[PDB]
Amino acid sequence: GISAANYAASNIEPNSVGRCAEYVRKAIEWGGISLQRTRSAKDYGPSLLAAGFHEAIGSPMKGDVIVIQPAPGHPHGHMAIYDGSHWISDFKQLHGFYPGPAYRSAKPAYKTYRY
Amino acid sequence: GISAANYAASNIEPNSVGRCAEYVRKAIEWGGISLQRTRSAKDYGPSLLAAGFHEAIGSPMKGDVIVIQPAPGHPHGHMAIYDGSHWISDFKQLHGFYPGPAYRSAKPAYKTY
Amino acid sequence: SPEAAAISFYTWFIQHDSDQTYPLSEPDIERYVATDTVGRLRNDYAHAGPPNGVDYFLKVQDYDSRDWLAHIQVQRALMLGDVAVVPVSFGSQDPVHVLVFLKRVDATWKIIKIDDTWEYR
Amino acid sequence: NSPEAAAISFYTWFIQHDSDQTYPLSEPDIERYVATDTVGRLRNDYAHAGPPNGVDYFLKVQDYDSRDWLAHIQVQRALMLGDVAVVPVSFGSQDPVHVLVFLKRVDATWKIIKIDDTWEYR
Amino acid sequence: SPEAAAISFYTWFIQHDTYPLSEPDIERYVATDTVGRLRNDYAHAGPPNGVDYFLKVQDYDSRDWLAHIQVQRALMLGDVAVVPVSFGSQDPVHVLVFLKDATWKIIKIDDTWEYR
Amino acid sequence: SPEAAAISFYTWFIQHDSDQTYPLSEPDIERYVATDTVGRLRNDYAHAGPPNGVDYFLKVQDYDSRDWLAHIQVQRALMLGDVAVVPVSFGSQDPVHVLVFLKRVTWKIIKIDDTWEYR
Structure with a gap:
């Protein structure tokens, strides 16, 4: 869990590269678990529940996975992992789990996951 | 008058360059009348009436001047002068008195003179 | 056939592209174009305008109705x-090139997107 | 009552209403700072295509640190x-982002009518 | 020197009232990608908002404007x-010119109109 | 030929999935994508991330690099x-399709589009 957060945080790009899902799945693989793939971040829930994750609710722990549904201009949703203070996708998210203002404004649904 | 339509037709650009009003005005001034300059095409009715022109209604004659109000993405409206076959602003309008899809879609008010 | 859906569409389009009418303002548009696409396009045209300034379906500002309507050429x-x-x-001269995207929606091809050949902006 | 003050107070309020729970264009208090037609247009852009150009319309970025940005709103005359x-x-504080705020007087009050970035024409 | 580019450019531009964008001389005043994109957009759809990109108007009194070009620092x-x-001199139009090797080039020009 | 250029580029691009420098920051992409285009894309990923919040070239947020690299297929x-x-x-399992746009400079990539509906 923790070493997966560490992986993601060690391997960020400066800015999004439209690869939040791959980046977090690679982080999970480093921390022990290989996940069944989907193409798009919004659909990564069942792949996570399958691999032995359960839904969390409440303050984030280091290693937690967020899966966010589409937002205007962002039809594939978003995915990220908490490093202890900062959510991590393909980039380090300084402002929150929502990776941008399209998301912050339209406030789409999300689930968090844990092991 | 007719010479105005002719001046307009000869002095066009390959495309719009955002100066429909300057082009139609300089045309009219070659035709005889120097209108009180104004920045926006949509505002040129009070200037034409404050000259020889009167509001035509029905089919267009060679020299008739249209003044069109804002469309989306086009806040300043549009001016044109018929050549007998085509409406003419800063370019030759192959489709009609509306100079593009924004206008044809939104169908804003217009006046002929 | 989708090539036929295409020609049929643009014929109807150009004939409804006048100073009195525009095909997006027509209920008939639903026949030829996917619903969400129409909704989006209408919003576009009402606020900011057509995307990138040009007709979304013909990808031009200006054209000759007659020349165009008699020179609609599709490829397989x-x-x-x-x-x-x-x-x-x-x-007929210096043709404009587009790509029409079509899904089968009921028993019909609906248009879901139109592309220009312009570089990335 | 100066545009610089309208500007400083607006961005101060904006950052504090920009989080994972709220967003300042949703907030009705937006109308206090931004011209209403501008708010209508912005709401439309955000609801359909997204914010213009991918970035925050007001802050011209996708992402930032709230606490640093809040502690370093530098304004010029x-x-x-x-x-x-x-x-x-x-x-x-470090490699700052620059915007241009366009304000007009609506009723002895300064309302934001436009915000521009410093990027090249696109 | 950016003030300077602004003035030489606008003086040159109003003087030329052929369209000046299509002339190569404009590259002395306007960043090169910027010229490209502008010629392209002019060809495709005409300039933004259907006003002249540089003067921000559909019509103007060129004599007076060439006579009254004020630049602030x-x-x-x-x-x-x-x-x-x-x-x-009457109801002056205001624009903001944005500029960026040894020379200063124009990368963008903005008007003062409300966004809506 | 354009088919050639397209495959060359994608093979190059997916084969660089492993490394630390994202392929767009890497100058060899200039062999494949047009200059202006690359410039604009670098600028945009820098500001807002890529369009639609998805990889601009692959059009997915995640993928089997192995499966894709062995099943690049192209038409005329x-x-x-x-x-x-x-x-x-x-x-080789629910293929993703992209259209790649190229112009003769050498053939180079000026644009790439998905098959998704406009809405």
Whole structure:
């Protein structure tokens, strides 16, 4: 869990590269678990529940996975992992789990996951 | 008058360059009348009436001047002068008195003179 | 046929592209174009305007109705999964080139996107 | 009552209403700072295509640190272009982001009518 | 020097009232990608909002405008120079010119209109 | 030919999935994508991330690099005036399709589009 957060945080790009899902799945693989793939971040829930994750609710722990549904201009949703203070996708998210203002404004649904 | 339509037709650009009003005005001034300059095409009715022109209604004659109000993405409206076959602003309008899809879609008010 | 859906569409389009009417303001548009696409396009045209300033379907500001309507040339369709792509050109000299994207929606091809050949902006 | 103050107070309120729970264009208090037609247009852009150009319309970025940005809103005196006040603003302590705020007087109050980035024409 | 580019450019531009964008001389005043994109957009759809990109108007009194070109001092926002420019003696039009090797080039020009 | 250029580029691009420098920051992409285009894309990923919040070239947020690299398939380029549109399918299980736009400079990539509906 923790070493997966560490992986993601060690391997960020400066800015999004439209690869939040791959980046977090690679982080999970480093921390022990290989996940069944989907193409798009919004659909990564069942792949996570399958691999032995359960839904969390409440303050984030280091290693937690967020899966966010589409937002205007962002039809594939978003995915990220908490490093202890900062959510991590393909980039380090300084402002929150929502990776941008399209998301912050339209406030789409999300689930968090844990092991 | 007719010479105005002719001046307009000869002095066009390959495309719009955002100066429909300057082009139609300089045309009219070659035709005889120097209108009180104004920045926006949509505002040129009070200037034409404050000259020889009167509001035509029905089919267009060679020299008739249209003044069109804002469309989306086009806040300043549009001016044109018929050549007998085509409406003419800063370019030759192959489709009609509306100079593009924004206008044809939104169908804003217009006046002929 | 989607090539035929394409030609049929642009014929109807150009004939409804006048100073009195525009095909997006027509209820008939639903026949030829996917619903969400129409909704989006209408919003676009009402606020900011047509995307990138040009007609979304013809990809130009200005054209001659007569030359275009008598020079609608399609090439054989592409199948990319369930999405059909039909290359179309308009006009007799210096033709304009687009790609029409079509899904089968009921028993019909609906248009879901139109592309220009312009570089990335 | 100066455009620089309208600007500083606006961005101060904006950052504090920009989080994972709220967003300032949703908040009705937006109308206090931003011209209403501008708010209508922005709401439309955000609801359909997304914010113009991918970035926050007001802050011109996708992502930032709230606490640093809040502690470093640097404002310069207004350029007065006719009756439009243009206020340069810079956010952040390290490699700051620059915007131009266009304010007009609506009723003895300065309302934001436009915000521009410093990027090249696109 | 950015003020300077602004003035030589606008003087040159109104003087030429062929369209000046299609002339190569404009490259002396306007950044090169910027010229490209502008010629492209002019060809495709005409300029933004259907006004002249550089003067921000559909019509103007060229004599008076060439007579009254006011430039205020450039502002620096990092790499970028913002130059306020006014034209005319009656109800002057205001624009902001943005500029960026040994020369200063125009990368963008903005009007003062409300966004809506 | 455009088909050639398209496959060259994608093979190059997916083969660089492993490394630390994202392929767009890497100058060899200039062999494949047009200069202006690359410039604009670098600028945009820098500001807002790529369009639609998805990889601009692959059009997915995640993928089997192995499966895709072994199942790049291409059809005859459509010729639209001086532009070549090459259809490409990746994968052997529910393939993703992109259209790649190229112009003669060498053929180079000026644009790439998905098959998603406009809405």
